[PDB]
């Protein structure tokens, strides 16, 4: 069981995955478990934009999964700034003072969303444009894990525990993009939020559920 | 009669259609109109998972159309359910004093919506794990047509009129699905049971159709 | 500037190499190199996206023109049930019939379940004709057919029609982003199009979108 690759790897389905993983998913990739019910991805150059796809949302799903928990864990030490849930945190651009990064008057303390939006725009335009075709480090190399620059520390060598690692990635990545998914439907259904949903649920799980909120979008008329 | 398999057969445009259908849909499998305008089952293995989709669906939709009308006409028949309404069914679960199957505190008198999620839970990954690999009820057989557990009727014998029933079981399950997808839409925008909706209709066709809930969810407010 | 071959007009700038996928090579209108989502990879599923792209641009054009017209004009002088289109559907069931152009003499339609199986047959039998043949052109090119559309003969000389063709799909793909605009504007707005403008051509810093961006939040 130790091997993420070949043609013997963990699969979604643990023991009930024989007669599932076809032909075209070997296992020669990080994160292959043989999930391919629907059959997306028969073609590979069709599967290795799907493959970039998974892993640039694995990244930014990663970056999110954190993002939204750490306004909330620093409200949990009792640092105020405007609002600490994240799906009513753009709202703080348009305050009597504007969004505050950590509360304390000195930090970003930015007022107009339309110029943070146009340097947004110009430099995740070329960051990104640089990250599909090249730029200034590294002009033609691997669209999924260029290196370089991007591991300064020395962890790209050895190849076997760079895929590991790779495998690392991607799971921590997928579980990310879940549980983003998950925060998106906890914020839509009960309105409040994720680390305040932990609260009551831990102050009360047997009737504070999502069984609790599963009569909200019955649609009366 | 009409016929719907090999070259000529039953199409999705009807007698407009000799040049409407694409070249992959040769017509060995059981309800194939031609209808892939849009080009997603080009490739085979696509087209294969496809198929297993389509049929899973299908079956499914069956069972659910068939459940959704089912307590509804036993309550306009003779039977006080605790809800009989099919999108309003679960929260009976949230009654105060059981969920009664046939109205009958007699019956399965459930209280717990999370033990019955759990055993469901259980329950339907074993059986779905024995669907795509095999267990108890047959280990090497036909991933979508099993048969000699799922035929104890024997109605898979004389196979000519067996890809007969294939076609209209894909047929009643195209049907279904398509009659689930007015289901839900039908509860989202009426707020009633079907057969409320069908007594509806059926009481005066000219403005309990769908054109009076055309201005409901309009984009003023 | 030439928009076929291997140096077009490309979506990422004059740095895309990297993102042009192998089966873009451009012998299709419209082609920038994007397909980074790896979608039309099949030949024959290019085939049927492209039809897909081109009727979606051509409805999507006649819909922003419909989006953009009675709105205009309404402060031209003539006056309808309803100028916005999002409400342009609801004046049947206002009293007093679906005027065209605001005369009661018009159309004066009250019935809309008539009007729909109207447009039904006739849709079904111009979309039946569209994908298999029929009495205005049997067998022909599947997206631009020729000799009963196009009759004024400005389909010929193959070089300008391509330019025409890299032309009508590039109108048809900023009409589909302006229709998706279109919908987005009514659902978080609930004013139209030219309204919109009008209100934000009266104050731009405030009436932009992010005057309506804490619409949809949750409870
Ligand atoms: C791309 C990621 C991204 C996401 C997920 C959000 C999310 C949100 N922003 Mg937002 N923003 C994002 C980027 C940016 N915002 C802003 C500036 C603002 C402002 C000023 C405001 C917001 C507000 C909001 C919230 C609207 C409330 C609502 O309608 O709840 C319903 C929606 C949900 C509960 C989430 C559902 C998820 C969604 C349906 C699926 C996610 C997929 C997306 C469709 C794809 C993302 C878009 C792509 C193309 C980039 C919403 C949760 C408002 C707010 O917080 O007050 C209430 C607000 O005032 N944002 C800027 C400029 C710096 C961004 C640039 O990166
Ligand atoms: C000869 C004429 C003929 C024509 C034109 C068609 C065409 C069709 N057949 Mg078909 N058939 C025909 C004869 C025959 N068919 C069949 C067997 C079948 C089968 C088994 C199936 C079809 C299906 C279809 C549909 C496929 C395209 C589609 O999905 O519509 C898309 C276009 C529309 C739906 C437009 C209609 C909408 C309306 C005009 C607009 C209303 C807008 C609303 C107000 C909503 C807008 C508000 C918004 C905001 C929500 C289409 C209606 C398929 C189907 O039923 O899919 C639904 C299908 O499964 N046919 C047989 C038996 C051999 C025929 C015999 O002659
Ligand atoms: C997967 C199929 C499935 C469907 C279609 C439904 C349907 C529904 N359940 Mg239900 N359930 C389903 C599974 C289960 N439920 C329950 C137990 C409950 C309870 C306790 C309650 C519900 C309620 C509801 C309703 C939510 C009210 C609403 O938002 O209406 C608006 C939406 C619709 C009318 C249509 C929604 C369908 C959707 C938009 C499209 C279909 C996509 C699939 C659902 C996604 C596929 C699921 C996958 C993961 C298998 C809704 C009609 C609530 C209710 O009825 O109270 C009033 C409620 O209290 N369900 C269990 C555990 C035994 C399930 C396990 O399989
Ligand atoms: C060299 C610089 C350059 C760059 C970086 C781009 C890149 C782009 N071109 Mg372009 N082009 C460039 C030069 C050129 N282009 C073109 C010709 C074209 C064409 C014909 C097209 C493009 C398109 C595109 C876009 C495709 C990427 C995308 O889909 O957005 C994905 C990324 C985002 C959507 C991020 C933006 C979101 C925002 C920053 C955050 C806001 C979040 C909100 C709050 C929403 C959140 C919702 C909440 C509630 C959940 C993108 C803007 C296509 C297009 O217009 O698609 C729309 C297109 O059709 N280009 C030419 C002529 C040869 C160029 C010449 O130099
Ligand atoms: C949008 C994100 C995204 C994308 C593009 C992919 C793409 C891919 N995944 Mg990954 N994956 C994701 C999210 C994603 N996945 C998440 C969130 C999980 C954890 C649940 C996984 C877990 C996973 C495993 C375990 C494996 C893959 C594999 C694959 C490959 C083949 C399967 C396929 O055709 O998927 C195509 C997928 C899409 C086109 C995305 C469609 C998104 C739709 C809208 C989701 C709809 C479902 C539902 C409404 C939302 C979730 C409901 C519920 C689960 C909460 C392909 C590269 C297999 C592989 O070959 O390994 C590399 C494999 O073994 N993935
Ligand atoms: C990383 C995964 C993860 C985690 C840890 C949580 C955690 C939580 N969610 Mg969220 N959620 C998730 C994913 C997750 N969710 C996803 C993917 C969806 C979309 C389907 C949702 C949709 C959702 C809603 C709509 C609601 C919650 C709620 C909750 C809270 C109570 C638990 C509950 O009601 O179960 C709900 C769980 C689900 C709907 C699916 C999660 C599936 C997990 C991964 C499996 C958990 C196994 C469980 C322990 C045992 C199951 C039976 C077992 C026999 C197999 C809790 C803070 C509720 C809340 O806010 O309470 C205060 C609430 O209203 N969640
Ligand atoms: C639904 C409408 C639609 C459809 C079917 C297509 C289909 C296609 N486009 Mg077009 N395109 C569209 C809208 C559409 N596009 C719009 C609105 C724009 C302007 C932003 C463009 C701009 C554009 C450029 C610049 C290029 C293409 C290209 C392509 C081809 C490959 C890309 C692909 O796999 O798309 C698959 C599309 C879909 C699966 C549609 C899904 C719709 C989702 C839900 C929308 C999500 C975002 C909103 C394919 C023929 C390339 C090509 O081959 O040129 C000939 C190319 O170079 N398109
Ligand atoms: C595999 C397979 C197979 C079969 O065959 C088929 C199928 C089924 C299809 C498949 C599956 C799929 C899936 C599951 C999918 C899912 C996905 C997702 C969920 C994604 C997300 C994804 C997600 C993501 C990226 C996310 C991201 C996020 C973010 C950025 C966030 C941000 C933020 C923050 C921080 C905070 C602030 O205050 C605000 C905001 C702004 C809000
Ligand atoms: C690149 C590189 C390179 C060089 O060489 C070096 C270096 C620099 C080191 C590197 C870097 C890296 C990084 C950045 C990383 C990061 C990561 C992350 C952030 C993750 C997250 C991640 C995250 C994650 C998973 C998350 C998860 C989550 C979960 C499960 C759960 C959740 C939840 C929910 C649902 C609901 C509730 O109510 C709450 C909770 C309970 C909370
Ligand atoms: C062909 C083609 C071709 C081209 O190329 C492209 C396109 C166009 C894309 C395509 C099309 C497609 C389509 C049409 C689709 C649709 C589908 C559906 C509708 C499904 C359903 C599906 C559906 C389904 C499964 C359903 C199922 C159901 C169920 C279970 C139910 C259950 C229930 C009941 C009993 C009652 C209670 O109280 C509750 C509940 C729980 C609610
Ligand atoms: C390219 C690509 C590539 C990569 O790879 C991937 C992806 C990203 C996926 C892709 C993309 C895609 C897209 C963007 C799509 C979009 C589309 C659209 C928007 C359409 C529309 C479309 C649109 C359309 C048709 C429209 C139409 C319209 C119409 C008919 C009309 C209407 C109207 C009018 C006016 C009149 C009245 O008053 C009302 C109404 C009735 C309302």
């Given at each position: 069981?130790?091997?993420?690759?070949?043609?013997?790897?963990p699969?979604?389905?643990?023991?009930?995955?024989?007669?599932?993983?076809?032909?075209y998913?070997?296992?020669?990739?990080?994160?292959?478990?043989?999930?391919?019910?629907?059959?997306?991805?028969?073609?590979?150059?069709?599967?290795?934009?799907?493959?970039?796809?998974?892993?640039?949302?694995?990244?930014?799903?990663?970056?999110?999964?954190?993002?939204?928990?750490?306004?909330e864990?620093?409200?949990?030490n009792?640092?105020?700034?405007?609002?600490a849930?994240?799906?009513?945190?753009?709202?703080?651009?348009?305050?009597?003072?504007?969004?505050?990064?950590?509360?304390?008057?000195?930090?970003?303390?930015?007022?107009?969303?339309?110029?943070?939006?146009?340097?947004?725009?110009?430099?995740?335009?070329?960051?990104?444009?640089?990250?599909?075709?090249?730029?200034?480090?590294?002009?033609?190399?691997?669209?999924?894990?260029?290196?370089?620059?991007?591991?300064?520390?020395?962890?790209?060598?050895?190849?076997?525990?760079?895929?590991?690692?790779?495998?690392?990635?991607?799971?921590?990545?997928?579980?990310?993009?879940?549980?983003?998914?998950?925060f998106?439907?906890?914020?839509?259904?009960?309105?409040?939020?994720?680390?305040?949903?932990?609260?009551?649920?831990?102050?009360?799980?047997?009737?504070?559920?999502?069984?609790?909120?599963?009569?909200?979008?019955?649609?009366?008329? | 009669?009409?016929?719907?398999?090999?070259?000529?057969?039953?199409?999705?445009?009807?007698?407009?259609?000799?040049?409407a259908?694409?070249?992959?849909?040769?017509?060995?499998?059981?309800?194939?109109?031609?209808?892939?305008?849009?080009?997603?089952?080009?490739?085979?293995?696509?087209?294969?998972?496809?198929?297993?989709?389509?049929?899973?669906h299908?079956?499914?939709?069956?069972?659910?159309?068939?459940?959704?009308?089912?307590?509804?006409?036993?309550?306009?028949?003779?039977?006080?359910?605790?809800?009989?309404?099919?999108?309003?069914?679960?929260?009976?679960?949230?009654?105060?004093?059981?969920?009664?199957?046939?109205?009958?505190?007699?019956?399965?008198?459930?209280?717990?919506?999370?033990?019955?999620?759990?055993?469901?839970?259980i329950?339907?990954?074993?059986?779905?794990?024995?669907?795509?690999?095999?267990?108890?009820?047959?280990?090497?057989?036909?991933?979508?047509?099993?048969?000699?557990?799922?035929?104890?009727?024997?109605?898979?014998?004389?196979?000519?009129?067996?890809?007969?029933?294939?076609?209209?079981?894909?047929?009643?399950?195209?049907?279904?699905?398509?009659s689930?997808?007015?289901?839900?839409?039908?509860?989202?925008?009426?707020?009633?049971?079907?057969?409320?909706?069908?007594?509806?209709?059926?009481?005066?066709?000219?403005?309990?159709?769908?054109?009076?809930?055309?201005?409901?969810?309009?984009?003023?407010?």
């Amino acid at each position: 069981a130790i091997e993420w690759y070949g043609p013997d790897r963990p699969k979604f389905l643990g023991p009930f995955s024989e007669g599932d993983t076809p032909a075209y998913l070997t296992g020669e990739f990080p994160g292959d478990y043989g999930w391919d019910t629907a059959g997306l991805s028969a073609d590979p150059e069709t599967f290795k934009r799907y493959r970039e796809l998974e892993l640039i949302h694995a990244r930014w799903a990663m970056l999110g999964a954190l993002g939204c928990i750490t306004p909330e864990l620093l409200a949990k030490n009792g640092i105020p700034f405007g609002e600490a849930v994240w799906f009513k945190a753009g709202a703080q651009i348009f305050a009597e003072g504007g969004l505050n990064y950590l509360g304390n008057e000195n930090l970003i303390h930015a007022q107009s969303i339309i110029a943070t939006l146009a340097f947004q725009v110009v430099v995740m335009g070329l960051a990104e444009a640089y990250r599909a075709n090249g730029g200034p480090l590294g002009e033609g190399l691997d669209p999924l894990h260029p290196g370089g620059a991007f591991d300064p520390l020395g962890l790209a060598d050895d190849p076997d525990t760079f895929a590991e690692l790779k495998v690392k990635e991607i799971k921590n990545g997928r579980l990310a993009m879940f549980s983003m998914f998950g925060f998106f439907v906890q914020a839509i259904v009960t309105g409040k939020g994720p680390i305040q949903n932990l609260d009551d649920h831990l102050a009360n799980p047997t009737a504070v559920n999502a069984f609790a909120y599963a009569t909200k979008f019955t649609p009366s008329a | 009669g009409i016929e719907f398999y090999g070259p000529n057969r039953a199409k999705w445009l009807g007698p407009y259609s000799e040049n409407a259908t694409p070249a992959y849909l040769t017509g060995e499998f059981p309800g194939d109109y031609g209808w892939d305008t849009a080009g997603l089952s080009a490739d085979p293995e696509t087209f294969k998972r496809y198929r297993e989709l389509e049929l899973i669906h299908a079956r499914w939709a069956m069972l659910g159309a068939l459940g959704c009308i089912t307590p509804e006409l036993l309550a306009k028949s003779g039977t006080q359910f605790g809800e009989a309404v099919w999108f309003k069914a679960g929260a009976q679960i949230f009654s105060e004093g059981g969920l009664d199957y046939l109205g009958n505190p007699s019956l399965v008198h459930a209280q717990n919506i999370v033990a019955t999620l759990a055993v469901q839970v259980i329950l339907m990954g074993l059986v779905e794990g024995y669907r795509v690999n095999g267990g108890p009820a047959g280990e090497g057989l036909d991933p979508l047509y099993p048969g000699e557990s799922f035929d104890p009727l024997g109605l898979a014998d004389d196979p000519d009129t067996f890809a007969e029933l294939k076609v209209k079981e894909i047929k009643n399950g195209r049907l279904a699905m398509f009659s689930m997808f007015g289901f839900f839409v039908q509860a989202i925008v009426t707020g009633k049971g079907p057969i409320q909706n069908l007594d509806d209709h059926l009481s005066n066709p000219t403005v309990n159709n769908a054109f009076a809930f055309a201005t409901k969810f309009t984009p003023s407010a």
